[PDB]
Design a protein around this ligand. Structure first.
Ligand SMILES: [Zn+2]
Lengths: 126, 369, 121, 54, 286, 204, 240
RNA sequence: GAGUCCCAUAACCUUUGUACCCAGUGAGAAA
RNA sequence: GCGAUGAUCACCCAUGGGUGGGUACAAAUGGCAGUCUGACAAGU
RNA sequence: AUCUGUUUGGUGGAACCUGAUUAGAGGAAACUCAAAGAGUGCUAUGGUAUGGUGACGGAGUGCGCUGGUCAAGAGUGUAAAAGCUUU
């Protein structure tokens, strides 16, 4: 189960990768993608330029969590809920969030690179 | 509209009248969620109109079982028929707020003009009156509500589990733990009686060594006598009258005192063997298989040292302390006795037949050697 | 509700007895009532099988209370003779226990039978 | 009181310097100053199991 | 709880109208204490009527969706239900009247061959309909005479109507020049108010159930609340996340305002922003 | 024991009352606890053993108080001046501590002061600490009447007068068993206790 | 076995540590003079003569709550004057320790559904009067809503997959606002197809969906493999 | 002047009389 | 004409004794083990 | 032992260095006087305030209102029905 954020969705649509099919042929496993309410709040706050990205995040195949905090800082929410539990893949393309996630141990990181998704800290990919 | 409220509680039934509705749409908000914690604002919502108390713990347990399995009892019928207005059954029923969605159908089966609500609004109204409790009732009930709660919880649980006080092994725990105490008490008290009568003649403790028999015969001999007919309860009695003729030891107030001491020893001596008969009977009705196998006093000490019939039952058979061939008949009797105690504990009203079969098995095993 | 309540039907009974036979070959089965209660109070047990037709029944009904205390699945097979025959010994057994082991070659089978009898229970 | 602290004042030193009583025991590093309220008590091993902790 | 009882893939196109009913069948009896009924028209030429399992009373203990399917030959654009007598009306290529028993329109009540974009029934004097046609027209219909009644042509297109629930002949129109018009049914020659403060096309209007103020959401991504006697906005609600508020209702509490935007979200607001919804002691109420 | 012999059962308590036991203010508490309780209902075959135990310990206390009557009688017939001074059971465990009445009589009054507190005494002598001042004589009624450091003071004067009366009782031959020497010694101790309870360390 | 320890109060109120050469988690004994499940006891003579009061060793391999305490929980809500609703009082093993931590002035409602554990619960609640045994299913709190009122902490040692619904129902009925919610989650008994961190994350998400704010979780690993205690408080308004 | 109410009403040791000994395991046993 | 409802597992003589180590109980005018100080104080 | 000189424990606290604080650092008393903080308790109850300024009250009548029952109407259904619905 993979936590998505907003620039990962934007780079997915910019590189024409499907979310669940890109995840499946990246990991060769069955993926459950998760949009937290703060990532969804960030996509809605991005305005009416990003309508395509918002209604591709509105997808019944993409399940969605319910964050319980004030504010819509998705990087704080993703970092907290991943270092609490260590049962999550983080799909992101922010340089700062990528550095945070790859500094906390045991957390695999997925990112749009080239024309498909790549995964780094998951040691069983083939 | 949530017009009336029915709160069931161990002291009786309460019908409240809802004064102000709480918000439906803003029911998850912070101020609406903590107005039921503040009492100064909850009393703006709820007003007590009726409280029918119970007739006692018997009717309390009856209504606790009826409320538990979702039925309208007769006291419920009385208080609802007193308090709720005769509304229509086809147009604008009166609205009662309950906390039990399967008690609702039993309320509409009896009063068709009553629609019942138990959703989150009625739930937090109900937990508001649960949170405040004794303050809403304005002083009109007998009995503290938590004390009635303790009584009703214990009664409900023993009813639901069918707790019988006949098959209650704590009686035989305390019976044998008291019987050992009075064994050593009759022993030390009659030892002091023999000591105080040792300087009246020191041969009664030589002829009659048993404590009770010594004490009862010295409760009526206080002198010389001759007339040795009612002192046989007669070779020992004849020797005792011969020793009274050849008296060879040395009051009145001290002798009256040691008569009171020997009367105390006799009273202890026949309260013992009343207790022993009681615990043999209680052991036959509580553990018949154990008492058929190894006897009533031995089974009593076995379940005492184990702590309970349940602890002796759930103990492993190789870890039972019962009291070569002589070394392994103990192990055979141990695992058969553990088997018998399991039968006897977990059967509900036990027979004696499996204690009989295990006694037959262990006598066959000892007669084989 | 009888005393020997969570009885298994025939398919679950044969699944249970097959994994009992394999654990008995792999030295992962402690068989008999007091060995079962020994391994139960020691905590090395994954599920206990009681047979619901021995000549008393409380003789092994002492064990559901122990399993409940320590949260261990317990299941009632309706034949002590078939249970002993599955255990691989020349006598009927009335209770048996699957001890825990992680160097065990039948761990998936034991876990599947545990899930089946726990959804039963 | 100090009258009882002057009777249990030695085994409190033993519990403070636990770490150098056995050369194989190796406790976790606490300090353990003497607590303000304590009580000295004796273990009752019961009459159920024998010979092991007895 | 802010959570859906049920969802329904109702149609294939846009569901262009939906309302709610207490369907007066004359063979069955409506169970309104455990079922709710909503019906809904779309541009795939269908009106569908659905029932919902509702947990509001605990009287009972069930075949929820799509109890019937009315069918038209052209598309539909609006729908509103009569507040009695099993009747509703659907606007579209032409405005038809329906009842929930018959599978076909009872009557076609169209002024001319110009289509109808919106519809509202009156709330008291329940047999007076009003409709907005795309020729910038507002038409009143009466259901005693089973006929249209009078129409006016304005400058731009009326997006919505709502009737005053406390005055029974007044209604408010919400139209494409950026303001709302408070009209008297007995004299449509003059508006009796104009509510002016919007800056793009007004998409939807609604009345408070107290009849004293209106809410008004528009194409500039903001909603506005107006006192009925003034004619300028008492309040504006906006959000960076809210885009193009297309539907606004005023909840029956008269205290909350439901807005449906076009990013997908339906949002609750307070009609009075500074007002909290707890119960109040008499010192704070005073 | 007397109350369970009186009532037995909780509903029986609801129908009965009692005033010779449990005086006048615990009645409403036992009635409220009888009305609501977490207790079961017993049977007759074990209520009979409960009743037998209750009458057993009632007769036990009857034997206790009549043995105390016997002790008071023998004590005021053997060493009556010690009874008039320090009391029956206090003088009794003095005599029983030291063995014989003559062996207690030939001991100095300081020993009779510290007579019960031997382990405190000899630890406070074998390390150089302060010795006790009360001993077995602390439970005399006069030392009960004193308060402060003057209960050490009148433990001392009570042991002095008790040595006087005790060796009079053991060594007299024309003794009359009437309490005369013990009574004049007790008057001396009482007015001494008066004159050192009259003083006060405050300044007025 | 006959040795001498020093009793010392823990950080948590109502529980103690007996220091020897191995130190023991220890509680005061509400029913002095007998052991309940065969644990060992400590008898101190505290100073009419001094009275022999005694203490019971809390075994972390037979108590999830003691495993949590001596793994280190920042806040238990079981406290010496409180009311605890124990769910899944599977015998009197941990309920006795919770009972005498809570003390004579506080109440433990021990809810259990099976009947032979209920018989042992009633015979234990005789000698511990502050235990109200409730033999009922916790999945229907209305069946015993008349016997319990306004608890301060719920403890949940149920081992069922509908755990979070049971906890939520009992909390919404009987827990007060900002009261304690202590949960012992067993991963394998919830479900074994996913890993332990997935099922703990889902259960914590279920708790905050039923508005119980989690403060703290602890894996309690040397005593139980793939267990957890989640300590939360019943926020009821504003987890934010 | 002065540490008992915190078991000298006691604790431990020694000797003398009375009743015993010197649990786990887990598939064998017999011929 | 077996068994998991459990098979199995200190010194001296040609079943019986001799010699003692631990267990509990009770006793001891057996032991530890030895019964504080000694002339002022209170008041006016 | 006019041997020994290490360790442990108490007393003591020079020089340097580090950290904090500074009208030097405290201490004791209380039916003392003030300044503030936190928690708890208490029906803490007018959602628009008594049944009534002879303008009023009470009694009775008439209208109004509530409930069930029966009858009639009407719809729907049907060979006829029955049933069901009916602001
Ligand atoms: Zn978030």
């Amino acid at each position: 189960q993979v936590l998505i954020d907003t620039n990962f969705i934007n780079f997915s649509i910019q590189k024409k990768v499907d979310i669940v099919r890109g995840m499946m042929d990246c990991l060769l496993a069955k993926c459950n993608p998760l949009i937290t309410d703060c990532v969804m709040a960030e996509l809605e706050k991005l305005g009416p330029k990003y309508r395509i990205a918002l209604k591709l995040a509105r997808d019944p195949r993409i399940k969605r969590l319910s964050c319980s905090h004030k504010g819509t800082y998705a990087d704080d929410c993703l970092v907290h809920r991943v270092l609490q539990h260590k049962c999550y893949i983080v799909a992101t393309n922010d340089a700062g969030l990528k550095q945070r996630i790859r500094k906390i141990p045991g957390i695999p990181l997925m990112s749009v690179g080239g024309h498909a998704y790549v995964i780094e800290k998951l040691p069983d990919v083939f | 509209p949530i017009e009336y409220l029915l709160f069931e509680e161990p002291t009786g039934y309460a019908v409240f009248k809802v004064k102000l509705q709480q918000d439906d749409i803003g029911s998850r908000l912070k101020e609406v969620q903590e107005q039921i914690n503040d009492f100064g604002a909850f009393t703006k919502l709820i007003e007590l109109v009726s409280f029918a108390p119970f007739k006692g713990a018997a009717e309390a347990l009856e209504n606790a079982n009826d409320i538990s399995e979702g039925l309208v009892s007769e006291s419920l019928k009385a208080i609802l028929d007193l308090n709720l207005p005769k509304a229509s059954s086809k147009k604008k029923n009166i609205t009662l707020a309950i906390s039990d969605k399967n008690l609702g159908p039993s309320i509409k089966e009896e009063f068709p003009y009553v629609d019942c609500i138990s959703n989150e609004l009625a739930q937090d109204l109900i937990r508001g009156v649960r949170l405040h409790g004794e303050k809403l009732f304005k002083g009109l009930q007998s009995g503290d509500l938590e004390r009635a709660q303790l009584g009703l919880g214990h009664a409900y649980s023993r009813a639901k589990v069918k707790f019988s006080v006949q098959k209650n092994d704590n009686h035989i725990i305390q019976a044998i733990a008291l019987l050992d105490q009075l064994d050593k008490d009759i022993n030390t008290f009659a030892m002091r009686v023999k000591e105080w009568y040792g300087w009246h003649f020191p041969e009664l403790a030589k002829l009659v060594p048993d404590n009770y028999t010594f004490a009862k015969l010295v409760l009526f001999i206080k002198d010389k006598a001759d007339d040795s007919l009612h002192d046989l309860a007669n070779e020992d009695s004849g020797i005792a009258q011969r020793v009274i003729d050849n008296a060879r030891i040395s009051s009145e107030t001290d002798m009256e005192n040691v008569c009171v001491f020997a009367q105390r020893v006799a009273s202890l001596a026949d309260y013992r063997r009343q207790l022993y008969d009681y615990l043999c009977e209680k052991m036959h009705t509580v553990a018949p298989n154990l008492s058929e196998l190894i006897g009533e006093v031995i089974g009593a000490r076995l379940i005492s040292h184990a702590g309970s019939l349940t602890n002796l039952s759930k103990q492993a058979a190789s870890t039972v302390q019962i009291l070569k061939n002589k070394g392994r008949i103990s192990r055979y009797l141990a695992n058969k006795c553990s088997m018998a105690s399991r039968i006897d504990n977990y059967s509900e009203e036990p027979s004696n037949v499996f204690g009989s079969v295990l006694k037959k098995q262990v006598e066959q095993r000892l007669e084989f050697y | 509700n009888p005393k020997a309540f969570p009885l298994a039907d025939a398919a679950l009974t044969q699944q249970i007895l097959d994994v009992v036979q394999q654990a008995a070959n792999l030295r992962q089965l402690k068989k008999g009532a007091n060995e079962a209660t020994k391994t139960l109070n020691r905590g090395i047990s994954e599920f206990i099988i009681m047979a619901a037709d021995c000549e008393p029944i409380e003789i092994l009904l002492h064990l559901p209370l122990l399993c409940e205390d320590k949260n261990v699945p317990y299941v009632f097979v309706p034949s002590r003779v078939a249970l002993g025959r599955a255990c691989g010994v020349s006598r009927p057994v009335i209770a048996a226990s699957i001890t825990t082991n992680d160097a065990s070659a039948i761990k998936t089978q034991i876990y599947a039978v545990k899930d089946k009898i726990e959804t039963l229970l | 009181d100090d009258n009882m602290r002057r009777e249990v004042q030695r085994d409190l030193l033993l519990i403070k310097h636990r770490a150098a009583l056995d050369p194989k025991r190796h406790y976790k590093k606490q300090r353990w100053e003497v607590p303000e309220r304590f009580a000295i008590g004796t273990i009752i091993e019961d009459k159920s199991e024998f010979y092991s902790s007895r | 709880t802010r959570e859906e009882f049920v969802s329904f893939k109702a149609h294939y196109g846009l569901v262009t109208g939906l309302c709610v009913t207490q369907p007066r069948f004359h063979d069955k009896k409506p169970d309104l204490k455990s079922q709710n009924f909503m019906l809904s028209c779309s541009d795939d030429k269908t009106v569908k009527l659905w029932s919902i399992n509702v947990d509001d009373y605990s009287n009972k203990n069930n075949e929820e969706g799509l109890i019937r399917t009315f069918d038209g030959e052209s598309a539909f654009q609006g729908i509103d239900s009569h507040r009695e007598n099993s009747t509703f009306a659907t606007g579209g290529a032409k405005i038809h009247l329906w009842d929930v028993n018959r599978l076909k329109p009872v009557s076609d009540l169209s002024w001319g061959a110009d289509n109808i974009t919106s519809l509202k029934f009156n709330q008291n004097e329940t047999d007076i309909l009003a409709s907005t046609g795309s020729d910038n027209s507002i038409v009143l219909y009466d259901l005693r005479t089973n006929s249209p009644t009078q129409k006016i042509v304005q400058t731009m297109r009326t997006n919505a109507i709502c009737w005053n629930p406390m005055e029974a002949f007044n209604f408010v129109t919400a139209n494409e020049d950026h303001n709302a018009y408070y009209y008297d049914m007995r004299n449509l020659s003059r508006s009796l108010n104009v509510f002016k403060d919007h800056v793009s096309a007004v998409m939807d209007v609604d009345f408070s159930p107290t009849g004293d103020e209106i809410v008004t959401g528009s194409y500039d991504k903001s909603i506005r609340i107006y006192k009925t006697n003034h004619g300028h906005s008492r309040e504006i609600y906006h959000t960076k996340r809210m885009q193009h508020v297309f539907q606004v209702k005023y909840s029956m509490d008269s205290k909350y305002i439901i807005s449906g935007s076009d990013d997908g979200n339906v949002r609750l607001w307070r009609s009075k922003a500074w007002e909290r919804s707890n119960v109040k002691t008499t010192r704070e109420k005073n | 024991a007397r109350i369970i012999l009186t009532m037995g059962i909780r509903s029986k308590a609801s129908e009965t009352d009692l005033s010779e036991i449990l005086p006048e203010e615990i009645e409403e508490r036992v009635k409220t606890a009888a009305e609501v309780s977490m207790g079961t209902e017993i049977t007759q075959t074990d209520l009979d053993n409960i009743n037998a135990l209750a009458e057993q310990i009632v007769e036990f206390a009857a034997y206790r108080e009549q043995l105390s009557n016997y002790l008071s009688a023998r004590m005021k017939a053997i060493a009556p001046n010690l009874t008039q001074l320090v009391g029956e059971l206090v003088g009794a465990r003095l005599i029983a501590h030291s063995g014989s009445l003559i062996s207690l009589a030939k001991s100095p009054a300081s020993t009779i002061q510290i007579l019960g507190a031997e382990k405190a005494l000899f630890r406070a002598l074998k390390t150089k600490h302060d010795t006790p001042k009360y001993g077995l004589l602390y439970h005399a009624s006069l030392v009960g009447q004193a308060t402060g450091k003057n209960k050490g003071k009148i433990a001392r004067v009570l042991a002095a007068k008790a040595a006087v009366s005790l060796r009079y009782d053991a060594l007299a031959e024309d003794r009359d068993d009437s309490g005369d020497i013990g009574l004049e010694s007790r008057a001396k101790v009482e007015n001494r206790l008066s004159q050192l309870e009259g003083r006060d360390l405050r300044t007025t | 076995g006959g040795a001498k320890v020093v009793i010392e109060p823990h950080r948590h109120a109502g529980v103690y540590i007996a220091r020897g050469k191995e130190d023991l988690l220890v509680t005061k004994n509400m029913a002095p003079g007998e052991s309940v499940y065969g644990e060992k006891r400590i008898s101190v003579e505290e100073p009419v003569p001094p009275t022999k009061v005694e203490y019971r060793v809390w075994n972390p391999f037979r108590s999830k709550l003691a495993a949590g305490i001596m793994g280190g929980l920042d806040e238990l809500f079981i406290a010496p004057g409180k009311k605890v609703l124990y769910l899944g009082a599977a015998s009197g093993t941990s309920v006795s320790h919770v009972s005498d931590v809570v003390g004579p002035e506080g109440v433990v409602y021990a809810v259990e559904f099976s009947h032979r554990p209920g018989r042992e619960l009633i015979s234990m609640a005789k000698k511990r009067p502050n235990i109200i045994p409730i033999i009922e299913d916790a999945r229907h709190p209305q069946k015993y809503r008349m016997l319990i009122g306004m608890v301060d902490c719920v403890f949940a040692d149920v081992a069922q997959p509908d755990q979070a619904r049971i906890i939520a129902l009992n909390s919404h009925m009987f827990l007060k606002d900002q009261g304690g919610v202590v949960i012992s989650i067993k991963a394998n008994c919830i479900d074994s197809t996913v890993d332990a961190e997935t099922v703990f994350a889902r259960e914590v998400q279920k708790l905050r969906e039923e508005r119980i704010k989690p403060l703290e979780q602890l894996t309690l690993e040397p005593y139980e493999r793939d267990h957890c205690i989640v300590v939360g408080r019943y926020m009821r308004s504003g987890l934010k």
